[PDB]
C-alpha cells in the first residue's frame, strides 16, 4: 500500500502463460561422473541409487559444466551437445533413452 | 488568473574543468549553444554538450562573446 497512490504492480503489465505440458529435467553435471571407474555404465537408476538424484522430474539432462577425466558409457533422456562431445572425447559413448 | 509554473530542468554544468570524464558523459545542459561544442564534444538535439571519448574537461574561450568546451586526454 502506498497511500492510495497506485501500487507498483498495478502500474505494470502482466506477462505470460504457464505451459501445462512443461518438461523440467533433473540437471546433472560432469563433475559427478568422475566418481565411477572407467568402462562402466551409468543410468538413471544408478544415479538415483547413488543419491546424486532423488527426483526424475520429467527426465534427466546432462550438462557440460565442468570436466570429466574418465571413459564412460552414459545413457539418459537428453544430453547437451557439449557434454556429449566431452563424453565422446574421453572415449565415452552416449545413448538416448 | 495566475499561479502556474513549470518543473525546472536542472540545466547548467555537470562536470568541472580538470575533471576526468568517461565517454558519453553530460557536460553542459542548455538551450541553444550558450556554450559551443568543441573538441571531442558533440551537441545533442536538445543542445546538450556531451563527451565522445574518455578524457579531461576544459572550458576554453572562442572569440570574445562566445565559449566552448573540449575534452583532451
Amino acid at each position: 500500500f502506498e497511500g492510495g497512490q497506485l501500487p507498483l504492480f498495478r502500474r505494470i503489465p502482466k506477462r505470460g502463460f504457464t505451459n501445462i505440458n512443461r518438461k523440467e529435467f533433473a540437471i546433472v553435471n560432469l563433475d559427478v561422473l568422475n566418481r565411477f571407474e572407467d568402462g562402466t555404465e551409468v543410468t538413471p537408476e544408478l544415479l538415483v541409487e547413488t543419491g546424486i538424484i532423488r527426483n526424475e522430474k520429467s527426465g534427466i539432462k546432462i550438462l557440460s559444466n565442468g570436466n570429466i577425466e574418465k571413459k564412460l558409457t552414459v545413457k539418459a533422456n537428453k544430453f547437451s551437445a557439449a557434454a556429449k562431445e566431452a563424453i565422446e572425447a574421453a572415449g565415452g559413448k552416449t545413448e538416448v533413452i | 488568473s495566475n499561479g502556474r509554473d513549470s518543473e525546472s530542468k536542472r540545466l547548467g554544468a555537470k562536470r568541472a574543468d580538470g575533471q576526468f570524464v568517461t565517454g558519453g558523459s553530460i557536460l553542459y545542459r542548455q538551450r541553444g549553444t550558450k556554450i559551443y561544442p568543441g573538441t571531442n564534444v558533440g551537441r545533442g538535439g536538445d543542445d546538450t554538450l556531451f563527451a565522445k571519448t574518455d578524457g579531461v574537461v576544459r572550458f576554453e574561450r572562442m572569440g570574445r562573446d562566445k565559449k566552448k568546451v573540449s575534452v583532451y586526454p
Binding site: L8, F9, R10, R11, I12, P13, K14, R15, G16 | -
Partner: protein
C-alpha cells in the same frame, strides 16, 4: 497459517538467480503514436524492481 502470495504481483514479476525481481516496463499499452521509437524500443525490454520497492513488496512474492 501460511502466507498467501500476492497474485497480481506473481503474474507480472519474475525472480533471478540473485533473488532479485524482474519486471516489465509500464507505458506500453495503447498510445504509441505519442512515444518516440527510442522510447518504445526500451520499454519493450525488462527491468529490475528497485531496492526501495523491493523492501516493500518482497514479502508478498516470497513464493
Amino acid at each position: 497459517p501460511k502466507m498467501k502470495t500476492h497474485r497480481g504481483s506473481a503474474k507480472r514479476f519474475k525472480r533471478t538467480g540473485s533473488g532479485k525481481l524482474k519486471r516489465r516496463h509500464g507505458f506500453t499499452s495503447h498510445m504509441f503514436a505519442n512515444k518516440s521509437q527510442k522510447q518504445k524500443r526500451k520499454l519493450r525490454k525488462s527491468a529490475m524492481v528497485s531496492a526501495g520497492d523491493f523492501k516493500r513488496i518482497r514479502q508478498m512474492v516470497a513464493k
